[PDB]
Amino acid sequence: SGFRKMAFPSGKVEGCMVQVTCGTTTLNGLWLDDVVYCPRHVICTSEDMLNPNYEDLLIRKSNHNFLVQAGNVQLRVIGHSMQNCVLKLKVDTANPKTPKYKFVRIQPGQTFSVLACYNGSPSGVYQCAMRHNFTIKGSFLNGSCGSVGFNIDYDCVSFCYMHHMELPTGVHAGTDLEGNFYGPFVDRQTAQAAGTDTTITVNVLAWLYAAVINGDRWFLNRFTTTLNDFNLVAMKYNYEPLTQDHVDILGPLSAQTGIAVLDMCASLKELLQNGMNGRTILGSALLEDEFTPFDVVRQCSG
Amino acid sequence: SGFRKMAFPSGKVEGCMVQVTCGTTTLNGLWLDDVVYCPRHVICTSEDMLNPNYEDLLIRKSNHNFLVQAGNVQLRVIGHSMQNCVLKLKVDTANPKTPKYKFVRIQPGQTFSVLACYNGSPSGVYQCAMRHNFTIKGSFLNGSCGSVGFNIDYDCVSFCYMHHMELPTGVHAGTDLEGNFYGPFVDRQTAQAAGTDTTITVNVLAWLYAAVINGDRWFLNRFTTTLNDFNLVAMKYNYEPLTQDHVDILGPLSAQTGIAVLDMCASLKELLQNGMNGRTILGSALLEDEFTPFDVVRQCSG
Ligand SMILES: Cn1cc2cc(/N=c3\[nH]c(=O)n(-c4cncc(O[C@H]5CCOC5)c4)c(=O)n3Cc3cc(F)c(F)cc3F)c(Cl)cc2n1
Ligand SMILES: Cn1cc2cc(/N=c3\[nH]c(=O)n(-c4cncc(O[C@H]5CCOC5)c4)c(=O)n3Cc3cc(F)c(F)cc3F)c(Cl)cc2n1
Numbered sequence: 072s073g074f075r076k077m078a079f080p081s082g083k084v085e086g087c088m089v090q091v092t093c094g095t096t097t098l099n100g101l102w103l104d105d106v107v108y109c110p111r112h113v114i115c116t117s118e119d120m121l122n123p124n125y126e127d128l129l130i131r132k133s134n135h136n137f138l139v140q141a142g143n144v145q146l147r148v149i150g151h152s153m154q155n156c157v158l159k160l161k162v163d164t165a166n167p168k169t170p171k172y173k174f175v176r177i178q179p180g181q182t183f184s185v186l187a188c189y190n191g192s193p194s195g196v197y198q199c200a201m202r203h204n205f206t207i208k209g210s211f212l213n214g215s216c217g218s219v220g221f222n223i224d225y226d227c228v229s230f231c232y233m234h235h236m237e238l239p240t241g242v243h244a245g246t247d248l249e250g251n252f253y254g255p256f257v258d259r260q261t262a263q264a265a266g267t268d269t270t271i272t273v274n275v276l277a278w279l280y281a282a283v284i285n286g287d288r289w290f291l292n293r294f295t296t297t298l299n300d301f302n303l304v305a306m307k308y309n310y311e312p313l314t315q316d317h318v319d320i321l322g323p324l325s326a327q328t329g330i331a332v333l334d335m336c337a338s339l340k341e342l343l344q345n346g347m348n349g350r351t352i353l354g355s356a357l358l359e360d361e362f363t364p365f366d367v368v369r370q371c372s373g
Numbered sequence: 374s375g376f377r378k379m380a381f382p383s384g385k386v387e388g389c390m391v392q393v394t395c396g397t398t399t400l401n402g403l404w405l406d407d408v409v410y411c412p413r414h415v416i417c418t419s420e421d422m423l424n425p426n427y428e429d430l431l432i433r434k435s436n437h438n439f440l441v442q443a444g445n446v447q448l449r450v451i452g453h454s455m456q457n458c459v460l461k462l463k464v465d466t467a468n469p470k471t472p473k474y475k476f477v478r479i480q481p482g483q484t485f486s487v488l489a490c491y492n493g494s495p496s497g498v499y500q501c502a503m504r505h506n507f508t509i510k511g512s513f514l515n516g517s518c519g520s521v522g523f524n525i526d527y528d529c530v531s532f533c534y535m536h537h538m539e540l541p542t543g544v545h546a547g548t549d550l551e552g553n554f555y556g557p558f559v560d561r562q563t564a565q566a567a568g569t570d571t572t573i574t575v576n577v578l579a580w581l582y583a584a585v586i587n588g589d590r591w592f593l594n595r596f597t598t599t600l601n602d603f604n605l606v607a608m609k610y611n612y613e614p615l616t617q618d619h620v621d622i623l624g625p626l627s628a629q630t631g632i633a634v635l636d637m638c639a640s641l642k643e644l645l646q647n648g649m650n651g652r653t654i655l656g657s658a659l660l661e662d663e664f665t666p667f668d669v670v671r672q673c674s675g
Contacts, residue, residue: 072512072513072514072539072543073510073511073512073513073539073544073545074512075378075501075511075512076377076378076499077489077497077498077499077512078380078497078498078499079497079498080383080384080387080488080496080497080498081382081383081384081498082382082383082384082385082387082388082495083384085382086384186382187379189675193382193384194382194671195379195380195382195671195672196379196380196381196382196383196498197377197378197379199377208375208656209375209377210374210375210376210377210379210672211374211375212374212672212674212675237374237375241374241375241587241588242375243375285543286543346651349648351659354510355657355658355659356657356658356659357653357657369496369497370497370512370514372514373491373514
């Protein structure tokens with residue numbers, strides 16, 4: 072037992088990370104087969120970063136303007152192209168460490184692992200969720216641009232996030248691997264603000280099930296509630312509405328614990344209206360909303 | 374910016390994980406050069422697990438009794454030996470993925486990454502600290518025996534923990550890679566209890582510095598305190614005593630933020646005596662003690 076914020080093992084992604092430099096601008100890239108993927112922002116000089124026209128900037132470049140370093144090896148660029156906010160640099164060598172992989176876009180409330188990298192060198196791995204306002208509460212320093220987020224299903228790395236930038240509130244914004252931003256953001260060094268965020272209700276419930284599986288039961292109660300009378304109370308506290316599909320997704324956890332979903336909702340209603348009275352759940356003093364039903368099952372059952 | 378529980382990238386360790394089977398008993402091993410390291414508990418049958426005499430059990434075995442699987446390859450055991458609670462299985466093939474590595478024993482309050490593995494297959498990575506009572510609050514299921522904890526310094530993996538078992542309270546116990554247990558535990562399937570734990574004070578202070586670096590300042594105050602009048606108040610709340618060496622270790626964070634260590638201690642004293650009044654620090658509603666001064670610097674400065 073026990074419950075941690077667990078990331079996927081990151082080795083399959085580490086063997087893909089490279090450094091990309093254009094001029095004095097540098098950041099991380101992702102090398103899969105004979106293509107290197109990276110934020111197109113790398114073709115911006117310091118004075119270009121404020122208000123770039125990327126089509127203009129890219130036509131003024133050739134392959135020899137891009138320096139790609141894979142460890143101690145320089146990869147020669149033999150082709151370049153833009154796809155939305157990602158640059159694709161064709162190289163003359165296919166990555167021998169390419170894993171089976173997929174480019175998938177994720178939904179708010181889903182989780183993924185991040186491999187934070189600097190100058191093409193992996194430095195750390197952590198688990199994050201995509202918030203309702205399409206930001207993530209990441210941990211990143213200067214140089215982290217191009218770090219990727221991913222999930223692993225069996226042997227296949229599903230890449231879902233490429234990091235681009237930090238917003239003024241300190242949260243992080245980026246794109247899927249086809250270069251399409253998550254949320255209403257653009258890749259220019261201007262102040263941009265995220266919309267309002269909500270608590271991911273289904274995840275909180277999933278985490279309450281995790282707690283029960285691990286012997287934390289103090290928040291349970293004999294009451295029950297209706298799906299509508301719960302949402303009426305959850306909106307008040309800035310929680311996403313619960314749907315019948317969320318209850319279905321929570322089915323398996325309901326079974327393993329024998330606690331009907333709507334019953335667990337009753338406990339959540341009480342926790343929101345009374346607080347925790349100085350107690351904790353799974354070692355935390357607030358309600359955690361960055362574990363999905365699937366993450367719970369993976370860690371608490373097998 | 375931002376602050377997460379970050380693990381080291383785990384690839385260098387993933388390429389070392391194997392499965393070891395003796396009879397119907399199976400668990401994880403660590404393959405470095407031509408040796409596989411694993412808990413000696415693997416030579417126990419179900420009825421041996423309660424009260425084993427390992428010297429007896431091992432003399433009754435030969436090399437052919439040990440099945441080592443590295444992915445789809447079986448490694449032939451050509452030698453076996455015991456070192457304290459670890460079995461060393463000599464194999465006829467050196468691991469081509471062996472990283473530079475060291476066996477180091479860590480201290481209570483230090484942190485490390487865990488690669489949780491099942492049947493020799495890595496499943497997840499998380500960051501943990503060694504508690505004052507020499508347990509860790511891990512996340513592990515059946516089959517996780519032999520998973521390793523480690524730190525990476527540059528290119529060198531310092532292995533510090535091999536997982537052995539879960540205690541009745543749900544916390545986890547194991548050994549260093551020389552087979553010496555952390556804490557007063559033994560590798561037999563009997564109920565054993567950990568001693569009392571304390572909060573790792575220097576880490577809490579390190580984390581308060583992280584919070585300041587990230588713009589969380591509400592807990593600060595103009596007061597200061599003396600090292601002795603802080604400890605007098607911290608003991609009351611089950612905190613480790615602070616030493617002059619802890620203040621020195623916290624020096625760099627003191628400098629980067631301009632907040633004298635004893636001043637930050639003043640804020641901690643106040644938080645312990647008043648609580649947090651429904652506010653949070655770095656997204657948490659309680660004081661976090663599993664980040665060391667070094668982890669903070671690594672994530673908050675570079
Ligand atoms: C020499 N050189 C200089 C370069 C500067 C660059 N710019 C960024 N580098 C970067 O790392 N971070 C960043 C991400 N996460 C956390 C962060 O935390 C820091 C900040 C406060 O705390 C610690 C920072 C950014 O935000 N940017 C801006 C930015 C990047 C984009 F891709 C974009 F489309 C629009 C932008 F506005 C790049 Cl990409 C390459 C460079 N080479
Ligand atoms: C067929 N087979 C059967 C086997 C059984 C085995 N025994 C253990 N396997 C194991 O995984 N965990 C465990 C660790 N962490 C978290 C855990 O969580 C579970 C428990 C509740 O929640 C989910 C469990 C253990 O505690 N043990 C006991 C144990 C192991 C030792 F090394 C020891 F020295 C003394 C012991 F008392 C082994 Cl090692 C190999 C086997 N092959």
